[PDB]
């Protein structure tokens, strides 16, 4: 009944580490005392329900706050000038000066200027009044209420799902593909065609009249006759103004491509057609697997048969079905890797192809969103690899994977790790050397000696996609090619203009700075992969510790014997690779932010000139753009960016405090706590007040965790401020 | 209304979390 009820070992633990480790292993349900697989799965299911309810509550809170305290209605009239308000500020610590400064956005109270793009998203989606946002918040609140009740219900005795149902892979994948992806995307396309395109074209479609108003003048007669080109006929004109009927068409499903000229975002007809088609594909693919009707596929059979001839990949994929369906960590790793790749994809695609009206001219929101999603992508990738390592050290069965495609990975892990080391070494050596060459050459007053490699291959991709300033004249750039001619009446007439228009972030012009920074990004990705892959492959054992699987995933060490065994557990591989995830995402975000600040400000010949050397990054990006942030508050007064300056210094302080736990280790602090225990016990008066848990220094893995925590939170706070405040102060 | 920030922010961010910290400490120091 003591705090770690799930772990009787921590229950008998008498020191203060009991509380730390109980909180830390609260959610490590697999290793809890007296745990069975069925109970584990049911608990995971209920926790998923609660988590979904949290997500929808967060969404409803954002919606309600913008409805109640935000200037959504005023912003709708003038999207490009009025600054969106996130929520009102309630702070008794604010002075009169801060009150006047934070009173902004055309309201009489202090407020926070939204940098999440929710205003643009909802305006594009079809929200026009605070009432719609409030009703959305109410409905999401009801949804979360139902999800919480469902989570409670699915732990009851008569309503507790079984392990066979949990492990029913075919039905789950069929339903997720067909309905969760497919029918939900179909629902979104229907929403667009019924509510968003009419609202963009100046029609108020809501629940009271969406049943009466026809999305298309012809109705479903074209859909049933098969003359679906009537839904593309009469597209929106280039003189269309978003939210008004002037210049508005009647088409509901088009493939115009490019961007809407006024809003510089893709056409809602194009997006509706996208979601409709993509759903067709997914609803088809959700009929792949066999579920209670004979017709379909058997995933175990597929994996078993996929073994190439003559044992090229050993025994092929035999046993992989069993390992994946038995081990939740492998499923978690696959999910995290896929979702991290998808997060990187959305980060790369939203800025290049904006979808929300007037987002492109909102420079702060774009940078905030890109940085946000790139960081989360990095975290998801690190988690995918960490859970792969946990699977290897906890759930991997060599008897099942005898001569398997997965076992051969462990078989030639030495080759894999050595070659990842080679490529990381080459990339870092050469990228750093070229950067230093450029640094010294510009330093010595002779920039002509800079070694500047043109990214010819990326430029060739841009030319093949439609760029023409490079003059390569290949594929779509060459109007005559089969690629350019076959698609010349669907999307190219708009895409060509969009890509060759220099006012867009679609396929930005690139140069030697882009070459060098891309090779740096390659170095970051390769080294992070090296650390993570090595951790995963050596989690089971090593020449320095062949029996590591007995110790498990996260243990402090093996002692000073055999030369020392620091950070050998393959959890410390994750903890090391987290630094590199932060490093490479920071490089990515610095590249994005500087190139986009230059492009938005209209001087791309600052990035093209200065980015070739590192002092250009240190001066024309960091030092130059740090002035509006650090000048948030000074001796003469304060501005509305004082919060960003304070949070900038805050992230610096946390990043610095992490170095304490990372550098100084447990013995010093343990002995110091012995001294403090002596003092407290020996002083009078205070010694009547006595602890219950014996105070001890933080454990080794605990302190590694705390130091990495302080590092990461620090990273994100510092760049968030610098990316949100410098953009605001420069535009 | 404009009443509700004053009523709710301090109730929810001084009183409730202090009570939660008290409850968690008392609970983890049981038996």
């Amino acid at each position: 009944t003591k705090f770690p009820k799930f772990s009787q070992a921590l229950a008998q633990d008498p020191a203060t580490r009991r509380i730390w480790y109980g909180i830390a292993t609260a959610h490590d349900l697999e290793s809890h005392d007296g745990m069975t697989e069925e109970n584990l799965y049911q608990k995971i299911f209920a926790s998923h329900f609660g988590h979904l309810a949290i997500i929808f509550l967060w969404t409803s809170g954002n919606l309600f706050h913008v409805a109640w305290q935000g200037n959504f209605q005023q912003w709708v009239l003038n999207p490009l000038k009025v600054k969106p308000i996130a929520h009102a500020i309630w702070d008794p610590h604010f002075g009169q000066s801060a009150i006047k400064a934070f009173t902004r956005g055309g309201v009489s109270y202090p407020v926070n200027i939204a940098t999440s793009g929710v205003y643009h998203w909802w305006y594009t989606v079809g929200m026009r009044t605070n009432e719609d946002l409030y009703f959305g918040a109410l409905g999401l609140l009801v949804l979360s209420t139902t999800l919480l009740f469902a989570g409670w219900l699915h732990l009851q005795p008569k309503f507790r799902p079984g392990i066979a149902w949990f492990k029913n892979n075919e039905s789950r994948l069929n339903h997720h593909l067909s309905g969760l992806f497919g029918v939900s995307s179909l629902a979104w396309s229907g929403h667009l065609i019924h509510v968003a395109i009419p609202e963009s074209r100046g029609q108020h479609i809501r629940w009271n009249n969406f049943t009466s108003t026809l999305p298309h003048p012809e109705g479903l007669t074209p859909f049933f006759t098969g003359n679906w080109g009537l839904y593309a006929e009469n597209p929106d004109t280039a003189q269309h103004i978003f939210g008004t009927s002037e210049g508005a068409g009647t088409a509901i499903l088009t493939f115009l491509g490019g961007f809407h000229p006024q809003t510089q975002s893709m056409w809602l007809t194009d997006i509706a057609h996208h979601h409709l088609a993509i759903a067709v594909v997914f609803i088809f693919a959700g009929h792949m697997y066999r579920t209670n009707w004979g017709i379909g596929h058997s995933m175990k059979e597929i994996l078993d048969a996929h073994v190439p001839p003559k044992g090229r990949l050993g025994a092929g994929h035999r046993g992989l079905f069993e390992t994946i369906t038995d081990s939740l960590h492998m499923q978690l790793g696959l999910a995290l890797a896929s979702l991290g790749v998808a997060t990187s994809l959305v980060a790369q695609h939203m800025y290049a192809l904006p979808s929300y009206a007037f987002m492109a001219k909102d420079y702060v929101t774009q940078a905030a969103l890109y940085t946000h999603h790139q960081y989360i992508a990095g975290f998801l990738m690190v988690g995918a690899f960490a859970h792969g390592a946990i699977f290897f050290v906890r759930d991997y069965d060599p008897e099942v994977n005898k001569d398997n495609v997965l076992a051969r990975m462990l078989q030639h892990k030495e080759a894999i790790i050595s070659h990842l080391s080679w490529v990381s070494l080459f990339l870092g050596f050469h990228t750093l050397g070229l950067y230093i060459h450029n640094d010294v050459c510009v330093a010595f007053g002779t920039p002509e000696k800079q070694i500047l490699f043109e990214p010819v291959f990326a430029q060739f991709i841009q030319a093949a996609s439609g760029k023409a300033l490079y003059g390569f004249d290949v594929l779509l750039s060459s109007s005559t090619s089969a690629a350019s001619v076959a698609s010349s009446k669907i999307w190219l007439p708009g895409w060509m203009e969009a890509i060759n228009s220099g006012k867009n972030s679609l396929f930005l012009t690139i140069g030697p700075g882009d070459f060098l920074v891309h090779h740096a990004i390659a170095l970051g990705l390769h080294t992070t992969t090296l650390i993570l892959v090595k951790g995963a492959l050596d989690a089971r054992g090593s020449k320095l510790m062949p029996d590591k699987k007995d110790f498990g995933y996260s243990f402090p060490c093996d002692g000073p014997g055999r030369g020392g065994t620091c950070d050998i557990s393959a959890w410390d591989a994750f903890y090391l690779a987290m630094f590199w995830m932060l490093n490479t995402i920071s490089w990515v975000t610095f590249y994005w932010h500087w190139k986009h600040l230059t492009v938005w400000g209209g001087n791309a010949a600052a990035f093209n000139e200065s980015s070739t050397y590192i002092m250009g990054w240190l001066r024309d990006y960091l030092w130059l753009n740090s002035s509006p942030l650090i000048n948030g508050y000074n001796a003469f007064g304060m501005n509305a960016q004082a919060v960003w300056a304070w949070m900038f210094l805050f992230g610096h302080l946390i990043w610095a405090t992490g170095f304490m736990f990372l550098i100084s280790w447990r013995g010093y602090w343990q002995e110091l706590i012995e001294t403090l225990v002596w003092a407290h016990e020996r002083t009078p008066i205070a010694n009547l007040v006595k602890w219950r848990d014996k105070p001890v220094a933080l454990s080794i893995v605990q302190a590694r965790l705390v130091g990495l925590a302080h590092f990461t939170v620090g990273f994100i706070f510092t760049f968030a401020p610098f990316v949100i405040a410098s953009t605001t102060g420069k535009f | 209304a404009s009443f509700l920030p004053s009523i709710l922010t301090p109730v929810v961010t001084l009183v409730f979390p202090g009570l939660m910290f008290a409850l968690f400490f008392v609970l983890i120091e049981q038996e």
Binding site: W68, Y134, L138, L141, L148, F149, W152 | -
Partner: peptide, 30 residues
């Protein structure tokens, strides 16, 4: 303009959700 009654109704639904959250936390704790 969101009304006082609207805010109070949303707050009531939020309180119902809170009660359900305590229940779900209990049932996950057992």
């Amino acid at each position: 303009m969101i009304t006082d009654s609207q805010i109070f109704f949303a707050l009531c639904i939020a309180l119902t959700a809170a009660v359900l959250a305590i229940g779900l936390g209990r049932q996950l704790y057992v």
